[PDB]
Each structure stands twice: as C-alpha cells, then as structure tokens.
Design a protein around this ligand. Sequence first.
Ligand SMILES: Cc1cc2nc3c(=O)[nH]c(=O)nc-3n(C[C@H](O)[C@H](O)[C@H](O)COP(=O)(O)O)c2cc1C
Ligand SMILES: O=C(C1CC1)N1CCN(c2ccc(F)cc2)CC1
Length: 344
Amino acid sequence: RLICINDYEQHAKSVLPKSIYDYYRSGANDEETLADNIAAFSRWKLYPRMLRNVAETDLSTSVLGQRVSMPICVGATAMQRMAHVDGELATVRACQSLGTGMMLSSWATSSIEEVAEAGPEALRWLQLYIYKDREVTKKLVRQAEKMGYKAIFVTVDTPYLGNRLDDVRNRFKLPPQLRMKNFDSGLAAYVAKAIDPSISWEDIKWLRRLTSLPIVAKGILRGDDAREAVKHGLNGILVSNHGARQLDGVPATIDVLPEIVEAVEGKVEVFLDGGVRKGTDVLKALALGAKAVFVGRPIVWGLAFQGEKGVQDVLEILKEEFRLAMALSGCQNVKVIDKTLVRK
Ligand SMILES: Cc1cc2nc3c(=O)[nH]c(=O)nc-3n(C[C@H](O)[C@H](O)[C@H](O)COP(=O)(O)O)c2cc1C
Ligand SMILES: O=C(C1CC1)N1CCN(c2ccc(F)cc2)CC1
C-alpha cells in the first residue's frame, strides 16, 4: 500500500469526509501558490558528488540548540482531532519515537499540558498567535514555559484569515464533539473576532520582553522583514507562506529562502515550510541554507491513515528518502550539504 507521502494523501482523501479533506488540502483563492510550493522544488536541480564514502550517513542536527534526529520537524496544523481521535497526542508520541520536534498549534484540539503529558521526552515548541486578549496570549506563553516547551513560533502572516474558497462553500466548522482546548467560513469569522489585526513590530517587542524562550518569526517572506526580526532580538525565521493559505500569489518558500538566508547574515537560524513531500525537497532546502524544514499536511494524512502509527510512518518515509538523497549526493552528514549541490 503506502510507500511515499503522495500515497498517504490519496488514502486520506478516500477515508475523510469531503469537508474535512478540503479544510486540510485547500489553499487561498485560486491556489496558485499552493501549486507553486510543490512545482518550485522541481525547478531546483541537484548536482550530486560521487565517490564520497556514504556508508555511515548521519541525519542528525540541531534546532535552536536542541538536538534532533533529522532536519525534518512537525509544523503546526490546527484541529488534528478531526483527522484521528487521538489528534495532537498521536502526533507528539510519534515525534518522541522519531527523535524530532513538534510545533503545537495555538488552535489545537488538545491542551498545552495534555500534549506535554503525552510526549514528556519529545522536543516541543508552541506556535502562538497574538490574540486581541493579551491576557490569553500571556497565559499560553507562560503555560509553554511551565510545561517544558523550548521555543515560541509567533505567526506573523495572519492579521486576518485567508479566503479558502472550499471552506466558504462547505461553511467550515469543527465537528460537534471537538473544541480548541487552550481557551461563510466559521474559521475566518473566528479569526476576525479573536486575532488582533493591529499587531506591529511593537507587539514583537512586547513578546520579546515577555519571555526568555527562543522566539521564531513564522511567515516572513521578505529580506527586510527578516532583518527587522533579527533587530528585535528574535532567534530564528521560519520562511513560510502558511501552506499557501493566506495571500495567494506569493512565491514558493523554496524560492524566497535564499534571499532570507542572505539577509540575516548568519545571525539566526532560518527554517522552511511549504511543499515539503520528499527527501530531495529537504536536501534542496538545506543546500540553500535552511537549518531544518517543517511539514504540515503530510502529518495530517498520517493521522488520517492510522493515528500515531500513521504519523510515525510518514516521518520514517521522509527520513529514509532524505538519507537516500544525502547518500546519492555524496553527503555523509548535514554539515557537508553545500550550495553547489543545487542550481535553478
Ligand atoms: C490544515 C492546516 C492547518 C494549519 N493550522 C495552522 C495553525 O494553527 N497555526 C499556524 O501558524 N499555521 C498553521 N498552518 C500552516 C502550517 O503551520 C504550515 O505553515 C504549512 O502547513 C506548511 O505547508 P505544507 O502543508 O505544504 O507542509 C496550517 C496549515 C494547514 C494545511
Ligand atoms: O485561543 C483561543 C481559543 C482556542 C480557545 N482564544 C484566545 C483569544 N480570545 C479572544 C477573545 C476576544 C477577542 F475579541 C479576541 C481574542 C478568545 C479565543
């Protein structure tokens, strides 16, 4: 049956209700950037070195000072219990098994504490939105601190929700037995009521003063903004177009990655998400200077297949594809994955 990430998507389409599959699949508007996040990887070609001794390939690396087994981590995707009963608890358990990290959504169907209890040994980070209610927002930061999360990924590309046409057509809402546990399209309306469209760099200053945890700006697409994040004392940039769900017609993340790596001059780690489906995608992102990549939808398809086991399967497929891509390219470890491996 399922031997690559595309197979898990096809399986998920067959078992999920249409409205749920569409919620997870969709991009914004005409979905131009959704297609490009994948197509763009194909335009970057690989230039493998031969004869380098790849008997011992070491995939390990570090994200913000914490060791991981592979440069492939789980991105925040809301409302995982729609895909499988165990939702975020299945995901964190898989991450713990694999030795990689999980970025927990602010809009999770499981609490900060519940996820820490299911994956006490797992590397865990909190994705944060700046809510109009700053008391709410501070409580989430404080809970992440108390519960052993290692960083805050502040999402900065969602002052309002993007217009995902299928969610408007299906009038998307949660199924009746689920809730966001830490507190037209129903989600777009939720955002307009709860999420602060006024936030600015001044609010980044506030968040930087609020916690000593490492803070990564998630959703940056311009070099000037990346430089501003560094000036505000943030500790990394997650180059992201929100899975192509916010502004349609922005570039693919792999295409804007080099500008952002150049702009930050090595001062902070740069990460990528958007369109990662294959081990060669991971290799390309690392050659262009990303420390690690995050996967969004593939994790949800793993949950839809088989909960914890299906997430573990998806992560193991990515890990093995990445190992093979490294070996065929002549790379024994991540430290020798250099820029001459790729050209556009
Ligand atoms: C179904 C879905 C839910 C998402 N929920 C969140 C969220 O709660 N918070 C957030 O910052 N980003 C959210 N994102 C964006 C992801 O964190 C990530 O940027 C994106 O999924 C990466 O692209 P990929 O799905 O192609 O791997 C979501 C994406 C999807 C597809
Ligand atoms: O994260 C959540 C939900 C998952 C539970 N909340 C925090 C922000 N709250 C907020 C209230 C009023 C308001 F006008 C703006 C923001 C309510 C929603």
